[PDB]
Amino acid sequence: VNKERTFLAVKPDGVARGLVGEIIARYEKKGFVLVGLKQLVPTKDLAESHYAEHKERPFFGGLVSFITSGPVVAMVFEGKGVVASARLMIGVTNPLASAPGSIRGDFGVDVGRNIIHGSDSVESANREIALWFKPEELLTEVKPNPNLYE
Amino acid sequence: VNKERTFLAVKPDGVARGLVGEIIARYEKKGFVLVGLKQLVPTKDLAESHYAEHKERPFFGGLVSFITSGPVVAMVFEGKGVVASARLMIGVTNPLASAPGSIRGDFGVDVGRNIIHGSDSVESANREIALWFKPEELLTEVKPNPNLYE
Amino acid sequence: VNKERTFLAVKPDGVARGLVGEIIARYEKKGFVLVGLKQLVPTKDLAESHYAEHKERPFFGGLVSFITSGPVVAMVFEGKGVVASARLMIGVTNPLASAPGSIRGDFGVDVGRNIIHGSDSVESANREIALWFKPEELLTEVKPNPNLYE
Amino acid sequence: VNKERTFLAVKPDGVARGLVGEIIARYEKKGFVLVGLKQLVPTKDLAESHYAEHKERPFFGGLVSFITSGPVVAMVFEGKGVVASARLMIGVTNPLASAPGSIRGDFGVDVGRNIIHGSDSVESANREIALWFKPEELLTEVKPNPNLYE
Amino acid sequence: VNKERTFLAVKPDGVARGLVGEIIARYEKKGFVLVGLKQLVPTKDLAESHYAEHKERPFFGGLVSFITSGPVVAMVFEGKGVVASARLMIGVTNPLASAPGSIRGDFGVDVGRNIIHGSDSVESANREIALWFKPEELLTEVKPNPNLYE
Amino acid sequence: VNKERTFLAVKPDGVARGLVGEIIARYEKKGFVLVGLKQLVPTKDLAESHYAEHKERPFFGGLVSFITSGPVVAMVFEGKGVVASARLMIGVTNPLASAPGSIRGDFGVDVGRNIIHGSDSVESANREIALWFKPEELLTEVKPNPNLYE
Numbered sequence A, B, C, D, E, F: 001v002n003k004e005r006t007f008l009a010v011k012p013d014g015v016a017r018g019l020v021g022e023i024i025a026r027y028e029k030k031g032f033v034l035v036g037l038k039q040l041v042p043t044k045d046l047a048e049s050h051y052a053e054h055k056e057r058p059f060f061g062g063l064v065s066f067i068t069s070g071p072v073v074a075m076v077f078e079g080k081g082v083v084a085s086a087r088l089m090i091g092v093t094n095p096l097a098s099a100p101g102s103i104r105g106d107f108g109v110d111v112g113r114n115i116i117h118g119s120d121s122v123e124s125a126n127r128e129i130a131l132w133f134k135p136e137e138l139l140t141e142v143k144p145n146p147n148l149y150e
């Protein structure tokens, strides 16, 4: 279904380096629809819930500290296979190993400063979307673009 | 003052044409800092308050009906002379008469669909910011690139 | 009316320098619709007709020889006030005096190699279009982006 | 041989989305020479021959119907290994599986609306070029750029 | 003459903000030829000589301090009317008052951090070039693209 | 360490095709810091020392003649795993097989004119750096950008 959604967030570094517009544009050009958007400074609880999967890792503390150190631009994009697609457009965890053309590939050089976050699954996406946004903050009316889908 | 703020809104036509990222990026590259950002579908009340100065004018109903016809990306930028600078970057009311390099000059062809709105003055800016954003949705700690201001 | 049309031609220098896509892209982003397009090496007669207004001036011979010296990308764009707008987007006769953001301003340095030609008025355009394209090479069904016009 | 040629076509969805210039530019920047170019609305017979390899498949009718539903920008590019290079620049059949940096990777989201067509082999290229372009519409004078080739 | 040259320098703020490539590319795209290029940390004597015309002003000391506060990318471009053209491409002293499309108009917000320096006349250009570059650091043979000059 | 450095050279073909700024900008956007830069016409001595590993191979003379055929823009970038990273951003030896998004992938069509050179290892980078630059021409301290590194 062309109604799948994923949660994307331009991290503090991405926001501080002026890459918000660059990132949003890449997703608009791709053909995905922005159904949620807002800037906020993540709280400690939000950070830890968002990254609950890593709470046991040694870098968890620093991860939470950094994600809450400055503004973050939270977004929700909609479209067929958007979750996996958005991840492909991002690259891989280590920006140095991310291919040119991908977001991390073009702008990052450190895993601890990898510019952006993207849901890794539909299940994670639904959970993350519900975590960062309120229902009222998400569009309900999209309208399929006949130029993007058959 | 380097902390002046201005309200900018990518109107329905701008959002539908996928110009949100492009516009945000132009202001980021300029050196202005994003202090507020969100997508919403303006309520009729909000719209009427926004265009209040035109309530007695014939086209009032039209402006209100359009800005509420679909999603709008609202934002607030901060930096020296941002109010005047932001509109210079936009061009003039008529995108056809706007010079290449400006937003309307590069992307618009109809004054009735001129893509974006920028506060016409500091006074209107302060008024629109308080109207479109709640205090908690605006950064309190800014600090732009240290290479921007003397 | 939003049905106005203008004739644009990327001259031998613009083509040789790889500016075809760049130019076409600017008009597409502006919102104008491509209603005609083709690459050709102009004939002596085609050229003499195109510059017919200068048939008496000494430089006439030069203009004819250059435009027929290599491939040219001829095109027709449609939209409100496209004629005047196209020229504004191109810049002024002398690229050195053309403002940054305009085509000549960004890519030209010589009046004799000014990259592109744009009709100077609606009557010159209708004449130029009929001269360079056969009616069957021009679209009759336009239907541009619905977010461009009020 | 640097005289190799491939047939490329921006299908109706690519034209409708204003991606003609962007695509043309990519190939120009790559170093391939444009030897043929024109916009036209393909006819049913041209389309069926073009998609001959699929005449026995159920999606044949749809492919034919779509490519003939609106304007298409047909082009021919010349250069060393242009056929395979052009496809690599396009990405893969499914835009969602196409890597960022490629045309489909950056702008497509559905196999049925994958923006562009490119010859899959030299045999197909020669066959397609002959189908879409008359000999008169193709340059005979190319002239290799010393900066591009050894 | 098309042999005219000008002296351009990306000041410490421009280098610090990652605008070196962007700037060089604008002049390259314009058609001007790079005849001298190098990054260095200007000494006080170089700085004071460069700004000799302001030697008896209150802002002098400040200009000398900043231009010597970090790496600068000094360069020399050659082409017809390059001096005036380069200035036009830069904008005006005050970036906020610089039109969109110009370097300062697109990237600056403070007159004290206006990104780049450009010679204001052939006289000063010939002086600045000799001040910043040694003979052996400048190309002797240029001969630019024949598609740029008639 | 985040102080690793690599040598990059925009060879004669890259400079001639006006790709200097485009390439510099790619590395700047990536987060790598320019610690050395200058344009020069390599002497035969420098060229042979640069390509020393192939002195006894058939193609040695060719590589030497070409890199000394015109101006070259030599540079040194610094950052975590910059050596390996810069090569990933370059693509592969054969530009035709280089993926879209990489430098050679987006701009080259011939192995003999593959635009740029990047050190293949840390050992060779250090060798090349000392070969092309004098210590005085390289920045000493850089200080890690808090936005780029942990």
Ligand SMILES: Nc1ncnc2c1ncn2[C@@H]1O[C@H](COC(=O)CP(=O)(O)O)[C@@H](O)[C@H]1O
Pocket (backbone or CB within 6 Å): A054, A059, A063, A092, A093, A094, A111, A112, A113, A114, A116, A117, A118
């Ligand atoms: N070895 C590490 N040291 C420090 N920080 C690290 C490390 N690995 C991952 N991170 C950080 O955790 C985030 C989540 O990692 C994930 O598995 C998701 P992702 O990186 O693919 O987007 C990553 O995005 C990144 O910010």
